[PDB]
């Protein structure tokens with residue numbers, strides 16, 4: 001996240017770090033004690049079996065016994081299209097169930113078909129790059145965003161931090177967009193580069209896949 | 219001042235490929251974005267075969283294909299400015315094959 | 322070399338193995354000694370630092386016949402065209418003179434504007450890959466035939482017969498390939514060509530720089 005702010009410790013206990021060989025490559029969301037939700041491109045070219053799911057984290061540079069760690073048992077996708085970046089959502093089943101507590105809680109999802117409109121105020125978050133060679137974030141970042149419709153396609157929920165150069169960046173794919181306390185987006189792609197200030201960020205529209213997700217986690 | 223991974227690559231433009239055997243340096247044990255790698259590919263296209271951004275724009279097709287250590291592949295359209303918002307390991311790329319056709 | 326045979330060690334003592342290093346990457350090429358202090362190769366093999374190995378058969382072993390020398394100068398033809406791979410010739414001035422012996426000695430160049438008739442049998446040698454899956458530690462070689470220019474002119478739209486040679490029969494799986502650039506086309510024991518480029522598939526025909534078109538430049542550069 002570029003131009004955001006350090007989240008309050010454990011402010012978003014549904015936030016997940018997906019790590020490989022000791023490296024955070026994507027974010028995810030705890031949607032059920034044994035299911036996390038991410039972007040399909042985050043797992044399409046990796047060996048899932050080495051991917052570790054980390055819950056209850058806040059500062060990835062520090063040791064945190066608060067954290068819970070799980071491996072990936074199975075994945076479930078619905079037609080991810082890499083050429084057009086459509087349906088960029090995946091559900092990962094874990095090798096266990098999370099113990100819900102002060103650091104870890106299951107997120108809350110919107111209803112099938114719900115579409116947010118222009119001007120809706122939402123929040124993005126993640127551990128992606130901080131921008132301008134600052135490198136990847138150690139402590140989870142959050143950013144106020146506004147839903148836009150220009151330079152967007154209906155297959156996505158698009159966001160813009162109007163008035164300044166900020167937005168999601170690399171390492172944030174798969175992180176949630178939330179909005180009204182409801183997880184409406186999963187970071188999918190940028191255009192031109194991060195924090196362009198002229199191109200919206202594109203999120204997978206979670207409210208378009210609600211039926212399948214419940215078909216998986218019930 | 220730090221170790222580098224040597225990734226084989228090939229470049230073909232208009233059906234011509236030079237017969238050297240070449241390798242791209244990536245910082246070892248590092249993480250990279252598709253913006254980073256795409257920029258390195260564009261730099262290689264220019265410095266090795268004089269292919270400009272303008273040529274990539276006017277070309278019939280301009281792509282590079284990553285072959286990953288797991289054996290999967292990812293075709294990247296150099297004419298597109300959309301980038302997935304993920305990071306990946308430099309150690310996981312087995313080969314890169316660049317192909318530009320002006321046609 | 323695709324579809325060739327392992328060379329007899331030291332049967333081709335002009336052969337040079339080039340290791341090229343630049344901040345952004347590396348390359349491997351072949352080349353050939355033309356004077357005790359100069360190696361000829363392809364311009365697309367240029368890079369910031371060049372290590373030349375003479376006298377080698379297995380480049381993965383530190384054989385005692387080997388002589389290792391850095392290129393003091395790497396002189397790309399001043400009109401080298403990286404876009405079309407034209408004027409693809411480069412001279413390496415070695416930092417020391419080689420020690421000439423059975424295993425290391427130069428190869429003759431052709432006479433001015435000397436020509437090569439279609440059908441002429443030539444040998445090409447190098448350490449390049451032998452397929453899409455495998456390479457070689459040891460020097461390999463393959464016999465190829467010079468072609469009529471029309472065989473290349475339709476496939477390679479920038480082919481120029483005044484400066485290049487068309488080599489290889491389209492029906493055969495016999496060709497130079499990746500890592501063989503810079504190596505010589507030997508016809509009648511003279512170096513007429515330099516391995517330059519072909520198709521990504523490795524299917525023939527392929528294009529070689531025509532050495533006889535660049536003799537004035539060669540002579541001037543070495544003096």
Ligand SMILES: *[C@@H]1O[C@H](CO)[C@@H](O[C@@H]2O[C@H](CO)[C@@H](O)[C@H](O)[C@H]2NC(C)=O)[C@H](O)[C@H]1NC(C)=O
Nearest residue numbers: 011121122123124142143144145178179180181
């Ligand atoms: C940025 O987003 C946060 C979270 O949505 C906003 O904080 C909320 O503000 C609303 C009123 O706008 C309050 O009702 C909530 O209680 C706040 N929630 C939290 C967790 O603090 C914040 O105001 C937004 N800032 C801007 C400038 O829009």
Ligand SMILES: *[C@@H]1O[C@H](CO)[C@@H](O)[C@H](O)[C@H]1NC(C)=O
Nearest residue numbers: 052053069070071072095096
């Ligand atoms: C699940 O995987 C994590 C990380 O590898 C490990 O710590 C945990 O013990 C595993 N649990 C089960 C039940 O496999």
